[PDB]
A paper describes a structure:
pmcIn the manuscript published in IUCrJ under the title ‘Modeling a unit cell: crystallographic refinement procedure using the biomolecular MD simulation platform Amber’, the authors described the results of the refinement of 84 protein structures using a novel approach that utilizes molecular dynamics and the maximum-likelihood potential that encodes the structure-factor based restraints. In our opinion, the only example for which the re-refined structure was deposited in the Protein Data Bank (PDB) does not provide convincing proof for the superiority of this refinement method.
The structure was originally refined at 1.9 Å resolution, but it appears that the refinement was not finalized. In particular, the deposited coordinates lacked any solvent that should have been visible at this resolution, thus despite good validation statistics, that structure has to be considered of uncertain quality. Thus, the number of refinable parameters was significantly increased, though the amount of available diffraction data remained the same. Their re-refined structure consisted of 1952 protein atoms and 155 water molecules. Waters were added automatically in Coot on the basis of 3.5σ peaks in the Fo − Fc electron density map. The process took less than an hour of human time and negligible computing time on a standard PC. However, if more parameters do not lead to better agreement, the strict Ockham razor should be mercilessly applied to avoid unnecessary complication of the problem.
Author numbering: 0 to 65
Write the structure that this text describes.
Amino acid sequence: MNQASVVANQLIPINTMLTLVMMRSEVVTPVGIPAEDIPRLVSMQVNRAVPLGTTLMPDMVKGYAA
């Protein structure tokens, strides 16, 4: 298994605008937002709290479509 997902590098509070320090790339299951999309996620808002080590999923990011 090779596909990496975006994983929270810190707790991300509800309604926070994402910054690069908050997002790492990890091979996790289930698969979330592809790691290659990190640059596109900067300044987008999360619609819930994302604990440290949580996989970022498309439904957690306001305005995200792929």
